[PDB]
Amino acid sequence: TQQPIVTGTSVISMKYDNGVIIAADNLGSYGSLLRFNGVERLIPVGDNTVVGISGDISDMQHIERLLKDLVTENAYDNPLADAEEALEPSYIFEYLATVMYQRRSKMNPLWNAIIVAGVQSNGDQFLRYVNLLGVTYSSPTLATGFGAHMANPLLRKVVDRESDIPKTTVQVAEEAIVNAMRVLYYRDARSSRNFSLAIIDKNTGLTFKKNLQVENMKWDFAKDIKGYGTQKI
Amino acid sequence: TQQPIVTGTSVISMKYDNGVIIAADNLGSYGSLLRFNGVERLIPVGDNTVVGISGDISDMQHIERLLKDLVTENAYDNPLADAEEALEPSYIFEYLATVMYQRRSKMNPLWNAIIVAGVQSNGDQFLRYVNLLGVTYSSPTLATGFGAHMANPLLRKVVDRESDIPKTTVQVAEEAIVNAMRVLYYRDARSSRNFSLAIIDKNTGLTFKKNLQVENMKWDFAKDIKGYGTQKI
Amino acid sequence: QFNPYGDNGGTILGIAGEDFAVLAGDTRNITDYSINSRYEPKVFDCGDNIVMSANGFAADGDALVKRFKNSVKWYHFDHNDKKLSINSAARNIQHLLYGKRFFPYYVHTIIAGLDEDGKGAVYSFDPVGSYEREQCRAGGAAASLIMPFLDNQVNFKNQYEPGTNGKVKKPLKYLSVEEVIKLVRDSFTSATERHIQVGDGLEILIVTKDGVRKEFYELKRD
Amino acid sequence: SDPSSINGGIVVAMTGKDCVAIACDLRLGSQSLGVSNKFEKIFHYGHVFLGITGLATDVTTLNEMFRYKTNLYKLKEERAIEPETFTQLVSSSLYERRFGPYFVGPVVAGINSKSGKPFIAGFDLIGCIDEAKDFIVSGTASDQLFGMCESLYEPNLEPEDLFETISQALLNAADRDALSGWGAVVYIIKKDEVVKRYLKMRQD
Amino acid sequence: TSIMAVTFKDGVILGADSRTTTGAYIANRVTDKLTRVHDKIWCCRSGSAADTQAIADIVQYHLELYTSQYGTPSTETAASVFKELCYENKDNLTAGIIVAGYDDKNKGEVYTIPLGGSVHKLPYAIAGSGSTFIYGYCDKNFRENMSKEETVDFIKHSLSQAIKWDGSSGGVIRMVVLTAAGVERLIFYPDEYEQL
Amino acid sequence: TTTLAFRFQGGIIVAVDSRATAGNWVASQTVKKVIEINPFLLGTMAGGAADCQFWETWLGSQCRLHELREKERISVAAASKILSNLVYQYKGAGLSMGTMICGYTRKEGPTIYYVDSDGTRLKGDIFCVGSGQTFAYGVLDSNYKWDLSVEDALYLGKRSILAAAHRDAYSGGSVNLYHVTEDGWIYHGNHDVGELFWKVKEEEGSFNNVIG
Amino acid sequence: MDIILGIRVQDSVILASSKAVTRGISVLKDSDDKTRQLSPHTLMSFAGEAGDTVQFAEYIQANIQLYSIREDYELSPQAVSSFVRQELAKSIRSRRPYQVNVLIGGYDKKKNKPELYQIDYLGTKVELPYGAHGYSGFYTFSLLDHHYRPDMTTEEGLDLLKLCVQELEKRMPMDFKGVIVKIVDKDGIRQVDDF
Amino acid sequence: MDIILGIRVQDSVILASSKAVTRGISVLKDSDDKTRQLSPHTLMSFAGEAGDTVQFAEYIQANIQLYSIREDYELSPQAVSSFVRQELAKSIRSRRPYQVNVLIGGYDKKKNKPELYQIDYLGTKVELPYGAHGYSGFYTFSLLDHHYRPDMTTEEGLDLLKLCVQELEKRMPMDFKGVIVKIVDKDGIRQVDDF
Amino acid sequence: TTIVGVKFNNGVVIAADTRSTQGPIVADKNCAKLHRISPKIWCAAAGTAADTEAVTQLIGSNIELHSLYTSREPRVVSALQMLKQHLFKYQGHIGAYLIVAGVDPTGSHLFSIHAHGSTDVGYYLSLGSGSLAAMAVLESHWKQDLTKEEAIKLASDAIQAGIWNDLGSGSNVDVCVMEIGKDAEYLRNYLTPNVREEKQKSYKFPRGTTAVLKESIVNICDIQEE
Ligand SMILES: *C[C@@](C)(O)[C@](*)(O)[C@H](Cc1ccccc1)NC(=O)[C@H](Cc1ccc(OC)cc1)NC(=O)[C@H](C)NC(=O)CN1CCOCC1
Ligand SMILES: *C[C@@](C)(O)[C@](*)(O)[C@H](Cc1ccccc1)NC(=O)[C@H](Cc1ccc(OC)cc1)NC(=O)[C@H](C)NC(=O)CN1CCOCC1
Ligand SMILES: *C[C@@](C)(O)[C@](*)(O)[C@H](Cc1ccccc1)NC(=O)[C@H](Cc1ccc(OC)cc1)NC(=O)[C@H](C)NC(=O)CN1CCOCC1
Ligand SMILES: [Mg+2]
Ligand SMILES: [Mg+2]
Ligand SMILES: [Mg+2]
Ligand SMILES: [Mg+2]
DSSP: OOOOOEEEOOEEEEEETTEEEEEEEOOEEETTEEEESOOOOEEEOTTSEEEEEEEEHHHHHHHHHHHHHHHHHHHTTOTTTTTTTSOOHHHHHHHHHHHHHHHHHTTOOOOEEEEEEEEOTTSOEEEEEEETTOOEEEOSEEEOTHHHHHHHHHHHHHOOSGGGSTTOOHHHHHHHHHHHHHHHHHHBTTOOSEEEEEEEETTTEEEEEEEEEOOSOOOGGGGGOOSSSSOOO | OOOOOEEEOOEEEEEETTEEEEEEEOOEEETTEEEESOOOOEEEOTTSEEEEEEEEHHHHHHHHHHHHHHHHHHHTTOTTTTTTTSOOHHHHHHHHHHHHHHHHHTTOOOOEEEEEEEEOTTSOEEEEEEETTOOEEEOSEEEOTHHHHHHHHHHHHHOOSGGGSTTOOHHHHHHHHHHHHHHHHHHOTTOOSEEEEEEEETTTEEEEEEEEEOOSOOOGGGGGOOSSSSOOO | OOOOOOOOOOEEEEEEOSSOEEEEEEOOEEETTEEEESOOOOEEEOSTTOEEEEEESHHHHHHHHHHHHHHHHHHHHHTTTOOOOHHHHHHHHHHHHHTTTTSOOOEEEEEEEEOTTSOEEEEEEOTTSOEEEESEEEEETTHHHHHHHHHHHTSOTTOBOTTSTTOSBOOOOOOOHHHHHHHHHHHHHHHHHHBTTOOSEEEEEEEETTEEEEEEEEOOOO | OOGGGSSOOEEEEEEETTEEEEEEEOOEEETTEEEESOOOOEEEETTEEEEEEEOHHHHHHHHHHHHHHHHHHHHHHSSOOOHHHHHHHHHHHHHTTTTSOOOEEEEEEEEOTTTOOEEEEEEOTTOOEEOOSSEEEEETTHHHHHHHHHHHOOSSOOHHHHHHHHHHHHHHHHHTBTTSOSOEEEEEEETTEEEEEEEOOOOO | OOEEEEEETTEEEEEEOOOEEETTEEEESSOOOEEEEETTEEEEEEEOHHHHHHHHHHHHHHHHHHHHHHOSOOHHHHHHHHHHHHHHTTTTOOEEEEEEEEETTTEEEEEEEOTTOOOEEESEEEESGGGGGGHHHHHHHOOTTOOHHHHHHHHHHHHHHHHHHBTTOOSOEEEEEEETTEEEEEEEOHHHHTTO | OOEEEEEETTEEEEEEOOOEEETTEEEESOOOOEEEEETTEEEEOEEOHHHHHHHHHHHHHHHHHHHHHHSSOOOHHHHHHHHHHHHHHTTTSOOOEEEEEEEEETTTEEEEEEEETTOOEEEOSEEEESTTHHHHHHHHHHHOOTTOOHHHHHHHHHHHHHHHHHHBTTOOSEEEEEEEETTEEEEEEEEEHHHHHHHHHHHHTOOTTSOO | OOOEEEEEOSSEEEEEEEOOEEETTEEEESOOOOEEEEETTEEEEEEESTTHHHHHHHHHHHHHHHHHHHHTSOOOHHHHHHHHHHHHHHHTTSSSOOOEEEEEEEEETTTTEEEEEEEOTTOOEEEOSEEEEGGGHHHHHHHHHHHOOTTOOHHHHHHHHHHHHHHHHHHOSBOOOOEEEEEEETTEEEEEOOO | OOOEEEEEOSSEEEEEEEOOEEETTEEEESOOOOEEEEETTEEEEEEESTTHHHHHHHHHHHHHHHHHHHHTSOOOHHHHHHHHHHHHHHHTTSSSOOOEEEEEEEEETTTTEEEEEEEOTTOOEEEOSEEEEGGGHHHHHHHHHHHOOTTOOHHHHHHHHHHHHHHHHHHOSBOOOOEEEEEEETTEEEEEOOO | OOEEEEEETTEEEEEEEOOEEETTEEEESSOOOEEEEETTEEEEEEESHHHHHHHHHHHHHHHHHHHHHHTSOOOHHHHHHHHHHHHHHTTTOSOEEEEEEEEETTEEEEEEEOTTSOEEEOSEEEESTTHHHHHHHHHHHOOSSOOHHHHHHHHHHHHHHHHHHBTTOOSOEEEEEEETTSOOEEEEEEEOOOOOOOOSSOOOOOTTOSOEEEEEEOOOSOOOOO
């Protein structure tokens, strides 16, 4: 048992017709202090998987090293490590889910919520969540922290059920993700403007975008709001 | 019942042959934050008394106003208010001690430690302490807070008993007070360099010195101290 | 302080007929007031014509199912591919649950299949491994809403023969698979109306001598 | 310790076609000990019926209080209080004890004598009104009653059908609750007759 | 919250961020924390939103009644009325208030009233959770008798940094300028102040 | 739960109820609270459902191993002591068990041992165990004599559980009845309280507290 | 004050109340009458917290005796029991409640019926053929469910009570030192002296 | 397990041990012998926590009976009591202590003297002319301080015990259901069957 | 609960869901959370249900008396001032969270108020357990210079986000529109997206199924003549 110290907020994600998108801001908070401003919380594994991590950053860095070592170990005595016996999103997820649940069962959790996004060998989209309790679930949209409360409602207006996924393009999905990140910057006190975004497509592969910013923000109506009630000037 | 918020540290004082000296630094701390740097904690009452106050500053400001109103009220219908029926140190003290004990008895203390220094009509030195519990005592030297632990041992080397008071000059006493204030700046984490000092003499009256600084500090030996043990460079 | 348990909601329901059994569960998964998923299956084909659900804290539920599936696999290896009977599964699941008696799996478990005479069987467990065979069981969040309805409509409790004053009970009948699926669908619609953690979808697994079949129905998404 | 489950008990009410029904169990206990088999939880003030579950001392006290208030109402107004008005009076009276509440789950049932409209309402312990068209439930087996009512109920039932439906809702809910049962009473209420029936139920 | 009031040659300026928090949720991102208690006496609010409103409404009432009977109250008088409420109800309130005003006689004045209900007259003051991060910056960059444009810049840069580092501060920067000329309300959006 | 076992002229009577609880929720009305360890040995269950089922089923295995090794049926004394020594190892861990081990051997005669999860082990002629024990004791002790007929003793055991089923909120469902003799145990049926209460009321002229 | 019982038969109410008064490790008294006559045909037994019990009983007694003098008339047992209930219900929301449980046994001369009311410290009232407060009810209610018939005589009622007292003497951990038995019928209240 | 007494007279040790076994609200048994023969001239009575008492007593019994067989010789009461003390002193610093208090009554055949040892669950041992564990000692120690003489006969010792049991039956709140009395002397251990 | 307020060109609109809960159980599927304070001042309620009903009824009563006393139509700022002072006095123990809106001679107004007595002004607001789901929609789709039709759409969309994504909220959408120069229109069950599907079976029992011990006629009437 511990308490999280340096933390990352929401990770948001969704499926679209040919792949998956995942995003997370670049902040490491220290309570209310916005301590570290260049933290990457999307971690690619091969060219078919991105693991998005929220919660304790020291435990995130531990998981980062577990994944890096998993790639090293899968290459051992494996001439098909860059082909049919490459690591899949489902293999990476089950490994992390196993670890998370073992750690909660010894009362020493990894204080994180994790989304594993990717594309399988057969072209299937993979999107699954696991957290510090070892609870796992899958859905067309997934989000951690504040993202669950604010991003999911927006992302579900685009993909409300399994049948909506082939109808959704990468342009529509990315726009919904980028909009959701702005809403989180408006409303989450432990969020930042700067973020990273990754698309794993079955045709174009892994695209990883760094140093995105929330843009086109409405603040202008603020000048008309005065006092809390009766104050006119 | 409350807890003190903005606080003042030690007040130190002693008797000498013809009068009394009292001093206190000019800081209002806010926990570990050294928030306010020009706070006067020596408050003169007439030309024969100085009340030195440590502890909660909001309660100090309340006491300041009680004393100011006491002077106003003593002048009412009193043609001898600037002479035989002027307020004495003993009158001011008993008033404060009465209030402090009443307030502790209602479980709503004034969160302070107070030293009333002065000279009576007959030339007698007055020096007495009272705190949030209504505990009162007198001694040739008196100090609050850290001052009790570090100032008193130094001041008692000069005036160790009643018989040492006529042997002690204002020059010797002021030097001891000024030295004690330096020691407190060295060693008390909630102290400041800037302080005020007041002398109430039976011949020369009230002298009130503002904007004193701790000076002639030994820091030079610091350059020779390296590591915590075995580290040579 | 770290709390190793959570509550993922949902509800499950097992009913046994003469030559079949059903195990139904909603497909909603929740924590607090959020929906995690509208379709996360909770009822599983475990092999040897046995279906299983472990409803409550989903991590414990998934661990338990995973271990029982593995138990079935090793039963085959160690006893010459012999079929694990439903009574034998039940006893095995008791030992899995009671193994964690002092750090329990936070779930209510139901298994369904056919007994060794081909008759429908529902077995039902508490979190630490006490069990009973029944015609009838609901587990999970809306169990308190659903069980009394099942007592009334499956075992005909408090129903008497009209005009017998009140001295001849309604006699017990097995129900057809069509009649059971009606009670299941109504049970879940009723629970969805009144329980916030129940909704989204209903997945029913039906077990006969010919194997395991699935049916799915939409439930209200609010 | 928890005052809403020391004594046990349940009340349910349902609307049908030009009729209402209200039913309760008869148990009064001290936790595991059943004490009385005759503790009715349904009262009437003229043609307005009130069921009360929860702490039995407050059930009794509130009955006496509403008898008092409706007696005075009738003397001053020169007519019997109607269910919509009595519902507001229950709410007012519960909310005036907001920070030292009566530990009760009241249920109002009756037919407006002018408009003929069937009426039921439920409340929380501090007076929030739940005015429902179908049914109202209250007590230690409220979860169980909600489940029975939500599946068994259909609109516009005739008095003698509604009787079967409400009785089966009560009986089967009570049997899954340790602190409810030990007998039951069902009032069937039409505009100008009220039949009261004691049910045979399991005595454990 | 991040709030400050700064005296300068022609008067005093008050500044504030616009974020209201409910835990980690931002209940209001365009809050107005600068509130008028008299024509040229304003205050910055930090701590409990309910407590500081209740206090500010009472002070506004006291000063309107002062005005009817005795004419225009001084800034010191306004601060005294805030203090009385904060000090006497210290057990039940969480209010950190900065009071700022302009007289023709006294020019611009700033009084800060922290948690315990003490009063402190200062050339400038900072308060709220975000103020911790700018004590160093503000001490190094404040001078007396700055121009209006200098003071606007000092506050803009100061609250910029408070907002950058404090998660409980954000949104727009609002300012109120108090001089003989009158009352000027300013606003500064993130796209201006972030890139400083 | 209410369970009872008593010794009389014609052997041992064992009677239990069939209710399971989860607080005030009635988990079941049809639970088996007697284990038939062997044809001459019975175990009764009260307390934690899982604790009772698991450890008394385990007890049966240990009794079976005794007769394989020693070519002889285990004594009631020895069987009860396996269970009591077991629960004593777990003492303080939070096991909840109240059990009666009832049986016949040649060397002992008809014998009843009370065993509970705090490690108490007692030989005796009469025991009632569980949340409803006092209700059962009231009826049982009032009408008990050494020399009841087998028919009257069966009825008293049945009547005593019914008494508890009625008054105790945490007992009910049905009455499972056993008779243990020289020749082993004999089942005397499951008796649903739904019908048994009203039958007994009418025939006996008792339960005048009830609206009937 | 541990055991108080009441049983109502054809034409009388019988109250049985234990004699022990115990503080900590010592039985201070073995002849305590846990009862007050409220009116000539109404008797109240009581049990609960030390001090509270007698103070409450005597307070009620004073009030009923006052009513009697003012109206030259005896309140019905139903009326006395409602008054007592209201006092306990008022008490439960006070700064310090009376922690007192009572049985009220009365003969109503107007209806020519015996009546027994069981009231707990919360103001929970019930009329019963038989009643008990505290742990005694865990043994006695089931006993009487079996052996009680509504048309019993006073002497049959006393034997039925002997059966109750025997069971409590067998199974209860505390030595309650026997009971004082009193009968309320049409001729008033009398104490059975040998039990 | 509440009351255990011991008194040592001229030529014997008498142990008296209550018969009740009580869990919560019910007396489960009224004929319980709270004693084990450790050797032919040594008897141990015991009281304390449910389960712990019998387990401890039987464990000690097993060990003394083992010593007897190995050496074909009976340990002196002093030796048995020291062994028991060490076991309790070892126990008190364990993960879960035995919560058991004991009296050991023995006749030492080598010295031709009776001996009575009182040992509590901490391993606190004392040899005494008379002893008691639990609340009984609050009444009995003062009784025996008055009435005990060192040169009493066995029958005088039994009357002195009747006086103790009478006082406990008068003043203690719990019904302990009488006592089983056993005498340890030069001819071994025997039970007085009528008390 | 999900409640929202949206300002538009000539007025303000408020909306609410219709679910009330008791623990995880739905107590009422069609409550009215839109409370009338005065004819043109309405508020949406979240929090402790009885407290919201009592607080709006009390302030509505006192607003009516104030309106009669002054011969003026009531202002939203008066409703707000009375609500804030009442709620502040009870230190959060009266758990009412309200979106207060209306039109009066001064114009159109939109406020929120919390249980502890803090108030806010806005062009768009949301409260209750579904306020985050609703605020996500409002932050994505709100613009200045909204028409009446656009504002009703936005408000009901924001409630729907609450209905679908928040377990605390469900059933139906209620709206009230307060436009300058016009009567306030209260749109009870404006949307009804959660009608229960047809049941598979009727559970109507055969008459006589339930065993009865006794019957009797209950006397409800007064004491009779002759
Ligand atoms: C740094 C910040 C943003 O917190 C600053 O101090 C704000 C000042 C402000 C906000 C709005 C209008 C005017 C001035 N304060 C807040 O945003 C406060 C933070 C706060 C909450 C509670 C306490 O309690 C001692 C102190 C500070 N936010 C609120 O007051 C919000 C509206 N209300 C709540 O969070 C509900 N509280 C929670 C704690 O218990 C009391 C009720
Ligand atoms: C009177 C009664 C009903 O309690 C009687 O003793 C039952 C005997 C019995 C015997 C065999 C099978 C089923 C029932 N016992 C129960 O119904 C128990 C009561 C009980 C609950 C909890 C504890 O906790 C120490 C002791 C006794 N009921 C259960 O065991 C229920 C079905 N299950 C649980 O309460 C689950 N919890 C999980 C956590 O660990 C404790 C058991
Ligand atoms: C989404 C939701 C359900 O929370 C929304 O806020 C509802 C608003 C509402 C407004 C007017 C009429 C009806 C409903 N609120 C409720 O349904 C509340 C939720 C609630 C429960 C408990 C607490 O406890 C602090 C706060 C809010 N439900 C109730 O108030 C119900 C009817 N009553 C109770 O749960 C019993 N109360 C709870 C509060 O303490 C007194 C007893
Ligand atoms: Mg639902
Ligand atoms: Mg029941
Ligand atoms: Mg029962
Ligand atoms: Mg910020």
